[PDB]
């Protein structure tokens, strides 16, 4: 789905598989977080489903030893003196030692501040222990976490529950038309983007000799040339758009290891899983009710939350017993209006537009020479048209699918292209879609605060700031203290400070609150990027302080206060909202749960071979399932006819479904349901088990079931 999604996939740790354990065999002990997981396996990264506790990610600093265990780096302490000498420890090795917490204050030389320090101990025990008894210390505060876990700013403010979803959802992000880097960062964004392998790094140092959208060339110091080729509009394994584009201009001096051209969800070699949006924390006219999300129409007009999606449709020509399927432009009983977008071979022309139901690859197969209808024979002598022997079997656009045809890849057995036995021509048509965000799309923050798009009001409707700036998104206040994820609040506070820029007051000295603030941050530009590492980074004090440091607009006026709030004008009524509204900037990802995909319905359609019941899945145009629990709801209600209708004519009444259809198009009454074929199957299944099952009428005689018994 995105670079991160792939990266975390490679570092997955599953207990499942051959030699491992089944899902039903797993108790409650195998799944929950064990003490030894610290620095080895992340306690936050794991699926929500019935897979929970059986799948996890590997911690950042961890590695595997040649024996199959998981090591983690610890800093070495001689005698109360932290060294730079590092040794990797296995689990049971750590047990026979004593490890100090990472954030325990350290003398500039390397000595501990307090004799008694926070100490980790065997069996998950923790106690204060004299500095002389300190063997090792942790490498980083952010040690225990996975890759995906680290990219969550102010993790220590969000409960493990919403922090969990926040991690899982990041893998579910979707590449946009162009990617913006998150204003608020954690530092992990960089290394992730590089290691993902879906961006392009420079092997050896040199200088850009020639750049194109197609490829980048680099002349090396030794005189050799290497050219990296861009992946342009390649379909992903999940239908997203892996597209790479050059960073550097021609003649730029670049050094080895530098990102010369990033790809999907990447800006300047950094993880860009979404956009920086203008947030507002307030309930608004009920359209954000129960975690629902409101959007500025600006995000549609400016393609801010728009993505690209490619589908691969495939069809082939085989050898039958009636001849062989040929792909041609001549399809039986089709006007030259429907064939308009096709070439001479029968394939869609590149760049053509396709809607659902239209033709992609004109294929026809010879039909079985069975005697055609004496009611269709008569119909062919009047109009004097002779029936062909080739039935249409062309590849038509599946429901919902649309967009532009961006590529045709043809393989002919004629052109010696090696096919599997029995195939002649094999066509692949690639269709791209440019999906602007819409209602029912799943937007998510990094704090496990999901939500679907409730309403997209026109830009003017938006509760806007005093200078006439319409907000981008209206989150709901209610679903914030409930979730225990107020890190999203802090992302907004720090976010707003990142957009305006700031400046601490140095007159009468550097203040006490910003005494722990590194020099580089006492001054910040408009649209400036920052890092808030996990279990480090911004503190609530510095944050509240920086809120007062907020620099005014182009109109010399401050917009928000020290609380973090501001005053809004109701875009509909014009009257200013009675109470101060918390406003700022938050990073928002567009997940891969889009209404375009998920929406589905069915009138009639295909049917099961055995049960003669409707098939399932959107792929097969199957209908929904009215299961056992759903039936109880009917039975409880008292709608016998509704329920009966659902499990007969709506389902597996072979003669029923056909007849109900006609009755509707004729505008007549819906008839009486018959015998479900599912039942007939059962009775013939039972009889195959030496179970002489007979259906008796009121008399006592065994009746037929559209079938007779003969020896």
């Amino acid at each position: 789905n995105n670079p991160l999604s792939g990266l975390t996939h490679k570092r997955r740790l599953s207990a499942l598989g051959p030699g491992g354990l089944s899902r039903e065999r797993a108790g409650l002990e195998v799944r929950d977080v064990h003490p030894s997981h610290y620095g080895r396996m992340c306690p936050i990264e794991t699926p929500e489903g019935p897979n929970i506790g059986l799948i996890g990610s590997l911690s950042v600093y961890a590695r595997v030893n040649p024996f199959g265990f998981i090591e983690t780096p610890y800093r070495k302490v001689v005698d109360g003196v932290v060294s730079d000498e590092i040794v990797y420890l296995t689990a049971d090795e750590e047990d026979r030692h004593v490890v100090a917490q990472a954030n325990s204050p350290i003398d500039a030389d390397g000595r501990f501040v307090e004799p008694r320090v926070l100490v980790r101990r065997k069996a998950g025990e923790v106690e204060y222990v004299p500095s002389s008894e300190v063997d090792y210390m942790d490498v980083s505060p952010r040690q225990m976490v996975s890759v995906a876990t680290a990219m969550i700013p102010f993790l220590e403010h969000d409960d493990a529950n919403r922090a969990l979803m926040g991690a899982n959802m990041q893998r579910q992000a979707v590449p946009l038309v162009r990617s913006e880097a998150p204003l608020v960062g954690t530092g992990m964004e960089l290394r992730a983007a590089i290691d993902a392998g879906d961006v392009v790094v420079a092997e050896e140092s040199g200088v850009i000799e020639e750049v194109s959208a197609d490829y980048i060339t680099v002349m090396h110091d030794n005189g050799t040339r290497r050219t990296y080729r861009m992946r342009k509009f390649a379909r992903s394994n999940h239908g997203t758009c892996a597209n790479q584009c050059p960073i550097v201009d021609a003649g730029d001096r670049v050094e080895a290891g530098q990102v010369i051209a990033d790809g999907p969800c990447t800006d300047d070699g950094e993880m860009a899983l979404g956009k920086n949006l203008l947030v507002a924390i307030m309930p608004w006219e009920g359209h954000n009710y129960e975690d629902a999300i409101i959007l500025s129409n600006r995000l549609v007009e400016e393609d801010v939350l728009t993505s690209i999606h490619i589908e691969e449709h495939e069809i082939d020509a085989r050898d039958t017993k009636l001849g062989a399927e040929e792909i041609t432009r001549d399809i039986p009983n089709i006007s030259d209006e429907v064939l308009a977008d096709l070439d001479e071979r029968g394939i869609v022309r590149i760049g053509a537009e396709v809607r659902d139901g239209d033709i992609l690859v004109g294929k026809v197969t010879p039909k079985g020479e069975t005697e055609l209808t004496p009611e269709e024979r008569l119909l062919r002598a009047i109009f004097g048209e002779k029936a062909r022997e080739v039935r249409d079997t062309s590849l038509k656009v599946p429901h919902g699918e649309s967009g532009k045809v961006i590529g045709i890849r043809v393989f002919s057995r004629e052109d010696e292209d090696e096919l599997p036995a029995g195939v002649n021509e094999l066509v692949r048509v690639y269709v791209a879609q440019k999906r602007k965000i819409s209602d029912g799309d799943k937007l998510a923050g990094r704090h496990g605060n999901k939500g679907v798009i409730g309403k997209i009001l026109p830009v003017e409707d938006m509760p806007f700031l005093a200078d006439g700036t319409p907000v981008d998104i209206i989150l709901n206040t209610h679903g914030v203290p409930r979730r225990m994820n107020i890190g999203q609040i802090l992302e907004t506070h720090l976010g707003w400070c990142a957009h305006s820029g700031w400046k601490v007051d140095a007159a009468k000295g550097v203040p006490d609150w910003a005494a722990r603030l590194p020099d580089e941050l006492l001054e910040a530009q408009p649209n400036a990027i920052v890092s808030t590492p996990v279990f480090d980074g911004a503190q609530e004090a510095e944050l509240q302080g920086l809120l007062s440091c907020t620099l005014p607009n182009r109109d010399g006026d401050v917009l928000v206060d020290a609380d973090g709030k501001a005053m809004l004008f109701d875009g509909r009524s014009g009257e200013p909202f009675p109470y101060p509204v918390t406003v700022g900037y938050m990073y928002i990802m567009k997940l891969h749960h889009l209404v375009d995909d998920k929406i589905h319905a069915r009138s009639t359609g295909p049917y099961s071979m055995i049960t003669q019941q409707p098939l399932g899945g959107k792929a097969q145009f199957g209908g929904q399932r009215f299961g056992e629990m759903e039936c109880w709801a009917m039975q409880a209600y008292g709608a016998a006819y509704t329920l009966q209708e659902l499990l007969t004519i709506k389902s597996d009444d072979t003669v029923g479904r056909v007849k109900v259809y006609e009755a509707i198009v004729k505008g007549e009454n819906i008839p009486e349901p018959g015998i479900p074929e599912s039942f007939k199957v059962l009775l013939k299944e039972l009889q195959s088990l030496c179970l002489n099952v007979e259906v008796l009428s009121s008399d006592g005689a065994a009746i037929e079931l559209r079938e007779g018994e003969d020896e």
Binding site: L190, I529, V530, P533, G537
Partner: peptide
């Protein structure tokens, strides 16, 4: 600066100095 190693845009960092070992 945070990761002053590859050639990345400067992302300033609220932090205690982290120099044990790079990711």
């Amino acid at each position: 600066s945070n990761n002053s190693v590859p050639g990345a845009p400067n992302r300033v960092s609220f932090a205690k100095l982290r120099e044990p070992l790079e990711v």
